[PDB]
Design a protein around this motif. Structure first.
Motif, mmCIF file in Angstrom:
data_model
loop_
_atom_site.group_PDB
_atom_site.id
_atom_site.type_symbol
_atom_site.label_atom_id
_atom_site.label_comp_id
_atom_site.label_asym_id
_atom_site.label_seq_id
_atom_site.Cartn_x
_atom_site.Cartn_y
_atom_site.Cartn_z
ATOM 1 N N UNK A 9 7.037 -15.019 -14.484
ATOM 2 C CA UNK A 9 8.251 -14.884 -13.648
ATOM 3 C C UNK A 9 8.501 -13.439 -13.138
ATOM 4 N N UNK A 10 8.116 -12.424 -13.897
ATOM 5 C CA UNK A 10 8.330 -11.003 -13.481
ATOM 6 C C UNK A 10 7.627 -10.731 -12.149
ATOM 7 N N UNK A 11 6.504 -11.417 -11.898
ATOM 8 C CA UNK A 11 5.573 -11.032 -10.790
ATOM 9 C C UNK A 11 5.720 -11.944 -9.610
ATOM 10 N N UNK A 12 6.763 -12.774 -9.526
ATOM 11 C CA UNK A 12 6.961 -13.657 -8.389
ATOM 12 C C UNK A 12 6.908 -12.947 -7.029
ATOM 13 N N UNK A 13 7.532 -11.767 -6.888
ATOM 14 C CA UNK A 13 7.589 -10.993 -5.631
ATOM 15 C C UNK A 13 6.174 -10.607 -5.128
ATOM 16 N N UNK A 14 5.169 -10.613 -6.041
ATOM 17 C CA UNK A 14 3.784 -10.215 -5.680
ATOM 18 C C UNK A 14 2.903 -11.451 -5.406
ATOM 19 N N UNK A 15 3.420 -12.668 -5.408
ATOM 20 C CA UNK A 15 2.601 -13.913 -5.289
ATOM 21 C C UNK A 15 2.250 -14.319 -3.874
ATOM 22 N N UNK A 16 2.977 -13.866 -2.874
ATOM 23 C CA UNK A 16 2.758 -14.246 -1.453
ATOM 24 C C UNK A 16 2.910 -13.021 -0.579
ATOM 25 N N UNK A 17 2.284 -13.074 0.630
ATOM 26 C CA UNK A 17 2.490 -12.013 1.603
ATOM 27 C C UNK A 17 3.975 -11.867 1.959
ATOM 28 N N UNK A 18 4.358 -10.664 2.333
ATOM 29 C CA UNK A 18 5.723 -10.403 2.896
ATOM 30 C C UNK A 18 5.892 -11.147 4.229
ATOM 31 N N UNK A 19 7.018 -11.851 4.380
ATOM 32 C CA UNK A 19 7.326 -12.658 5.593
ATOM 33 C C UNK A 19 7.729 -11.680 6.701
ATOM 34 N N UNK A 20 6.929 -11.508 7.781
ATOM 35 C CA UNK A 20 7.275 -10.572 8.858
ATOM 36 C C UNK A 20 8.640 -10.826 9.524
ATOM 37 N N UNK A 21 9.150 -12.061 9.441
ATOM 38 C CA UNK A 21 10.499 -12.433 9.945
ATOM 39 C C UNK A 21 11.551 -11.683 9.134
ATOM 40 N N UNK A 22 11.627 -11.983 7.842
ATOM 41 C CA UNK A 22 12.575 -11.348 6.891
ATOM 42 C C UNK A 22 12.460 -9.818 6.895
ATOM 43 N N UNK A 23 11.247 -9.266 7.066
ATOM 44 C CA UNK A 23 10.972 -7.812 6.822
ATOM 45 C C UNK A 23 10.016 -7.286 7.901
ATOM 46 N N UNK A 24 10.472 -7.131 9.170
ATOM 47 C CA UNK A 24 9.606 -6.660 10.256
ATOM 48 C C UNK A 24 9.067 -5.236 10.049
ATOM 49 N N UNK A 25 9.803 -4.423 9.294
ATOM 50 C CA UNK A 25 9.462 -3.007 8.999
ATOM 51 C C UNK A 25 8.308 -2.916 7.983
ATOM 52 N N UNK A 26 7.961 -3.997 7.274
ATOM 53 C CA UNK A 26 6.995 -3.913 6.142
ATOM 54 C C UNK A 26 5.644 -3.398 6.661
ATOM 55 N N UNK A 27 5.123 -4.046 7.705
ATOM 56 C CA UNK A 27 3.783 -3.732 8.259
ATOM 57 C C UNK A 27 3.697 -2.403 9.033
ATOM 58 N N UNK A 28 4.833 -1.788 9.379
ATOM 59 C CA UNK A 28 4.836 -0.441 10.015
ATOM 60 C C UNK A 28 4.741 0.625 8.912
ATOM 61 N N UNK A 29 5.162 0.306 7.681
ATOM 62 C CA UNK A 29 5.103 1.220 6.501
ATOM 63 C C UNK A 29 3.745 1.059 5.785
ATOM 64 N N UNK A 30 3.401 -0.183 5.449
ATOM 65 C CA UNK A 30 2.269 -0.534 4.554
ATOM 66 C C UNK A 30 1.047 -0.961 5.423
#
Ligand SMILES: O=S(=O)(N1C[C@@H]2C[C@H]3CCNC[C@]2(C1)O3)C(F)(F)F
Ligand SMILES: O=S(=O)(N1C[C@@H]2C[C@H]3CCNC[C@]2(C1)O3)C(F)(F)F
Ligand SMILES: O=S(=O)(N1C[C@@H]2C[C@H]3CCNC[C@]2(C1)O3)C(F)(F)F
Length: 130
Positions: free
Chosen positions: A26-47
């Motif tokens: 359960x601790x690692x749920x946030x690391x199980x799937x790619x970041x949703x570009x809808x929810x977080x458009x800034x993710x791919x400009x940083x990472x």
């Protein structure tokens, strides 16, 4: 040789088992799937090289990893991406950083206990011959 293809098949079986043990925690749920570009458009400009545990499973099946060292470079990239995207003092960033460090530490501790050092050296010598 057939023997070398058997060695890489055993490596993929080992890596799928370690990855599924991380993915169900359960601790690692946030690391199980790619970041949703809808929810977080800034993710791919940083990472610049996103990575997650579902992509790791896909890479094992595509025969991307010939050694446990090359698998651990992608576990390290999951952790370093979370440390760089969530770097602030607030509780939400400190919680993801603690979880990213626990994912990395847990992967390395399972490998220290369950990987034979001579099985890893064999994979490294087959990789270096190709
Ligand atoms: O099965 S999961 O639904 N989930 C969904 C992902 C897809 C597969 C393949 C590997 N990447 C992680 C993951 C984890 O497993 C959970 F129970 F929540 F762990
Ligand atoms: O951190 S390690 O130095 N490291 C380096 C080792 C060599 C490659 C091969 C796969 N697994 C082992 C290892 C992990 O990666 C150790 F603690 F010794 F395991
Ligand atoms: O400044 S950031 O774009 N950023 C991305 C995140 C978005 C908000 C909300 C969460 N907490 C961390 C963060 C920091 O703030 C980065 F360069 F990625 F650090």
């Amino acid at each position: 040789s057939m023997q070398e293809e058997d060695t890489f098949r055993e490596l993929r079986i080992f890596l799928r088992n370690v990855t599924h043990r991380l993915a169900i925690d359960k601790r690692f749920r946030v690391f199980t799937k790619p970041v949703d570009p809808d929810e977080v458009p800034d993710y791919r400009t940083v990472i610049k090289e996103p990575m997650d545990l579902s992509s790791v499973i896909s890479k094992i099946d595509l025969h991307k990893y010939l050694t446990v060292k090359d698998y651990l470079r992608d576990i390290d990239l999951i952790c370093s991406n979370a440390l760089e995207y969530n770097p602030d003092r607030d509780p939400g960033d400190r919680l993801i950083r603690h979880r990213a460090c626990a994912l990395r530490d847990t992967a390395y501790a399972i490998i220290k206990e369950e990987l034979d050092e001579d099985f890893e050296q064999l994979c490294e010598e087959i990789q270096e011959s190709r």
